[model samples]
Target: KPKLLNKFDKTIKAELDAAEKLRKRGKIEEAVNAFKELVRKYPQSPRARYGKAQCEDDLAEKRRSNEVLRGAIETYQEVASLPDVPADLLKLSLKRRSDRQQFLGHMRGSLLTLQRLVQLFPNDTSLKNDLGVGYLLIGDNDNAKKVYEEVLSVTPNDGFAKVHYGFILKAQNKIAESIPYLKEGIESGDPGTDDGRFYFHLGDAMQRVGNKEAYKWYELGHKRGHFASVWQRSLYNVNGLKAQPWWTPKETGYTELVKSLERNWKLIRDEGLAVMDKAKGLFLPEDENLREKGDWSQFTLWQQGRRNENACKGAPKTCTLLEKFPETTGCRRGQIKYSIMHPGTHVWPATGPTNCRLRMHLGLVIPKEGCKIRCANETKTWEEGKVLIFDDSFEHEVWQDASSFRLIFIVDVWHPELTPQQRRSLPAI
Candidate 1:
């Protein structure tokens, strides 16, 4: 008998093996049932509980069902907490549970699970790094930094820790200080540094610091196909959409609707101003790595195919007008909002998540000079009551040097070429 089965009686061992066989044979549901039967018969058997949990976890992944995933999480927690459980199983359970928790957005629970794993295996640098990442995901940078500090001390040349620490520095807004670590970590020849994210971050850090050489890393990322091109670095993309830097409203089959929006621009602009006046703090700063200088904010009316009722309530007329165009309001992976760029702002070249949407900007306020947008090889300025349509998945940048604020009613619509089924089925980014 194997050492793992030695503690159990022959009958129980045989039953466990049969259950394991069913699991290994891919009869996941049957295996789960078998394991549950064993667990009911032997309530104290960690093996039975683990088998059930593992099967359930696999089933949850296959089904992509939140309910099943939660069930597995609970079972794994039980196994991890069980007295006299094998140390290996305990570790596995904690790690698996932590992953599931993180996937479900249970940040604190994931952190606690990782903390337990680190405490159990204090010398394991890999687990320490995981704990550090867990902290960073929850925006607890101080603790993340402290954890990475510990990890780097032990494995001074560890590329993962270096890169993650660099990420923390960037999150703390020390963009300049983050470059060397990001560069060194990416070039450390470590296995994990082969990701495009490292290259992108290093490039972004360089770009933000006004280094022209940032294009080098971006080009490298493009060569690796991590990005569409040097100027189009949208990370999330759907294949087969027509890729272009600029687009006409007619090309999107929304020209008539675009004209309607243009005709109502002043009315929309008035509501936008009224909403801004009444909804204090509703227009929040854009939370991304795009802004390099000055202020950029947005008041979203639709997001990820869902209406932002709270914001819509403040701009009823604009929202009512938007409701007529399902192409904009129902874009699963896109949004509709009012974009506000303050004077002297410079938004860095950036791209959206996917090529499945075409972006539109109905200019409500525009300055005569010193305000322009650059998309690929072309540069253009916005005009009041006019619509500028483009593929936001292509890299674009904006600058506002004019003395007055710039406002645009932004809308993103499903790419015209996507079939109705594709538009309905594609996952929200």
Candidate 2:
């Protein structure tokens, strides 16, 4: 017969396996029941609480099918506070609980949770952002303002804080003072935020201050499906406007800056982007081109490297010194097909495809013959050796009608509008 401890082990393992299987098979409620029993029986294993909380959250949001025995946030709280819990799990649990509490209208409890978290992870600006918002919700504008300002001091291009602080100023009726901050924040577009709310505040602030451009932002905010009333009060029908894309520039207004130097070629000041993207995303926005899902497959450089290295591997190259540019490579003589939809390289696995915090990476493309770039928004054609600098954030793909040794050399840099300090603040590669 098995020993007493062995018997207990079998019982726990069998139950855990069954609960996990239920979770995987879409029997979320059944899994919830099983995991609850496990957690109750073995309270010392804080790790066991994570899946139950996740399932609870998903159940509520996904299907509303589970017979939730307790609050999702409640389980996260137990997991978040356990002394034996790993820091990463602790952070996740704390965030989950705080976000849920805020969603449930327990603003003070959310604030309390965040306050506790910030003390433990002082360098975590994301936690501080929640704390600032909690202060804003609680009508403590002074503390809210101070909290965001500190975030800016730490990282100047923090788009979320920048946008929210602009709103704080607008709330205080400092429209003129707030306008520039709003504009800068939205323009920064740090690829970590979708700033429709930023546009809402911007338009409202501009509207109150007699700026005629208010209509433009008002229209944009409405387009993103935020506050329809603002646009409905002034201009086109919300329904009509929502169906259309932004009237982005078509003219590629960039050429050799020194007439001979592809060296530091910059776009002419007319806002004509070869990659005219408002809807932005990228796998490696500034890496040598080649992936296959659309508009690419004829040539392969990145894939060759991956094969030679047995996987995606690289050492830091020229622009690698830029904090945002990681594993920068001096790639040549190949084509990257249409990139597949996947997780981001820098933040990997945490950020999936299709969330908006966007700015383009600077890259140069030279085909051996003419190739057509079929972007999600529009398509363009360019020729061999006539290098094109473009943004990769747009949902773009490329196709080659001819077979040749097509080459792409990718590079990363600050977006043209960034300040020196702003460049330093990018959490890229």
Candidate 3:
């Protein structure tokens, strides 16, 4: 009996040794099968089960590298579920699963896993940074900013955190404020130094403020391989022209509109009330006197009735009544209204000519049921409080999967301070 037991033990040991050797040689399938055989022969052995799990993890990594994501996920889940697996190993498996989910575009799942990782290691700055990146990708900028700020608070000199913060600021159009963060990132000896992009952004902000030395910064960025130098140069050239100034027309028109609207309030109220009654198929009630607040009152009434489209349509023609209040209203500013057909109730299409310069104007877009302003070409998703500025020349379309109404605001305003030369250089399509 003793000799038989000894022989059986030798065979089992030899099998386990062979499995280890196969695993070390990267023969994952063979190693897994060998480990499975050991587990079957020694069902009570923890070592055998651990070996099987390890082999499975190896095979899973191989599958992942081959883009077999589903297979990798399954194998990783199996390893993670094994009883007695070390906590570190389990954490690693979970992280791998999360990565696979992200690659498959399962953002919500990725976010959940990232949150878990942060909870598991609250003091890990690296994990916090990674969580911030995930938040940014998911369009949760507020959360992302919070995570990044926390990282900075703990490690003030973290280069990656600085770079990310700079990105957030730039997206908000706080270009000047973004400069120092990007500069710090570049100076921190991190991989993929962004000195060139930093200077380019700085130059852009300076150009907006009409800085004469913007060209020097542009040249610096260009020499450092920033592709935006071309556009910056063009902007600088345009700035060189002395225009009449943007404030002139704004002040004049704004003042006139306010004055006219106030002085002609009674006439506007009467006309608006009449229009409302006719549209409603009824006469105005005697007790409901027309308000003498001009367009402002009309706007309120229209809003109360949810007549945005009608209000916009009437705004331009309403200026005609201003002639009676010449002392309050001077020349009228041009206003136009148009309707756009959206692809879906939630999607709207937008198109503009390349390099076209436009005067200040306001565009109000209303979409029919199941339509929205679809930002197909945009890099980010659109939601309330989200603002995007892009060249109007880009041909873009919207999708309205589950919306009933869409509204858009478009505007063009003339700046009187622009010199003739500057105005000529302004691109208009």
Candidate 4:
């Protein structure tokens, strides 16, 4: 029974000397007990503790239990902490401690210890893998990568490390050799990385590297919603994703709060059109947004036209919707505005926004018969008294091909998708 007791301790020395004879004589259970008793008497001694971690491993293996692996890990912590422990034993203790940390799901914890341990035992090739596994959990892709590659240089059969390293290879533009590692990981290798995102990464890599197995991996990833967003989601530039071709108009469906407007259309056409016609007109779109489009004169029935919130501060309804996403520019932007787009080429280059631009076309002075709107995906004809609720953010162009002077009474309102609180509070910029 080796004890963790001090080297020159007087009281426990003789008792510890008696315990080892039992250990050497095929009495492992008794030896483990004697050592445990030795540790119990001398809690801080390295004498019995060094043997304790090894004995525990045997007990678990004999019992065919996985708990011992974790038990060994816990015991190693004590072994490493004992005063004047041997350097070789300290190195082993650190490696096994990290191994157990990763296996038991403490990835960050495992990484922190292994990263320091790896430097202490620089030539210990196995510790490279221990460091690699820890790096990925927190998105330290840059460092996790080199160690995995370094491992493959000497120890090529490591399946788990290959799959993780494979993606890094492609990301670094080492496309040629990446797929085999990724494919093998999924097919018959490493049982460790089984999360849905792994399938997504494997599928994405193979899709670019080889098509034979790409579709299967892609389908697996889709079922798991792994492609719901991209890798390093928070790190991705949100504005960069704004104008994606993959996004479809059919996907951006509309919700209507107000039902039929057959008669209401005529009522607005008769009443609101006259009210708008009476509003004073500017030479151009009347605001910075519209001015950029060739002199498309407009009369603001209730257009913010780049007015401030202090103006909205007077109107409770305006204040409710005037937080800046468009609120910074307009006075009464979201609560429903009646504006008239005077006939012209009005080529502002592109559509401005995606929401709160729903409009009803009403012609009071004259009918807008043949104006055309072209979007990146589709085209629409502007017909008087017809309501067109559309996401204006799509890249769009308009044509007022009418030879005669024409007026389009377009309206903007709060998008129906606005939650109750959203409708009341200002949206983020």
Off by over 4 Å in 4: 1-40, 45-78, 83-112, 119-126, 136-142, 173-177, 207-212, 219-429
Taken over the whole model, the C-alpha lDDT of each candidate is: 0.86, 0.51, 0.49, 0.54
| Candidate that would win on lDDT | 1
Residue 344 miss distance in model 3 (angstroms): 34
Question: For candidate 2, lDDT tens digit of each residue in 90-141?
Answer: 7878888888888777889889998999998999998898899889878889
TM-score of 4: 0.38
Please list the residue runs of candidate 2 whose C-alpha ends up more than 4 Å from where it truly belongs after superposition. 1-18, 58-70, 191-193, 222-429
Q: Which candidate tops TM-score?
A: 1
Per-prediction TM-score: 0.80, 0.48, 0.41, 0.38
Q: After superposition, how far is residue 232 of candidate 4 from its true place, in Å?
A: 19
Which of the two candidates, 1 or 4, achieves a greater lDDT against the reference?
1
Pairs of residues clashing in candidate 1: none
Candidate ranking under lDDT, highest first, comes to 1, 4, 2, 3
Which digits, one per residue and each the tens of the lDDT, describe model 1 over residues 1-429? 223332553347788888989999998889989899998998777778888899999899889899999999999988866566666667777899999999999999999999999989998898898999899889899999999899888888899888888988987889888888888887786766667887778887887888888888888878877778887878777778788888888788998779888999999999888867878489989865677778889999999889999888899888898899999899988899999888989898777778888899999988787789988879988999999998888778899999888999999899999999988888897
Segments of candidate 1 deviating more than 4 angstroms: 1-18, 33-49, 62-71, 74-89, 189-197, 223-225, 261-290, 295-325, 329-342, 403-407, 426-429
Ranking the candidates on TM-score from highest down gives 1, 2, 3, 4
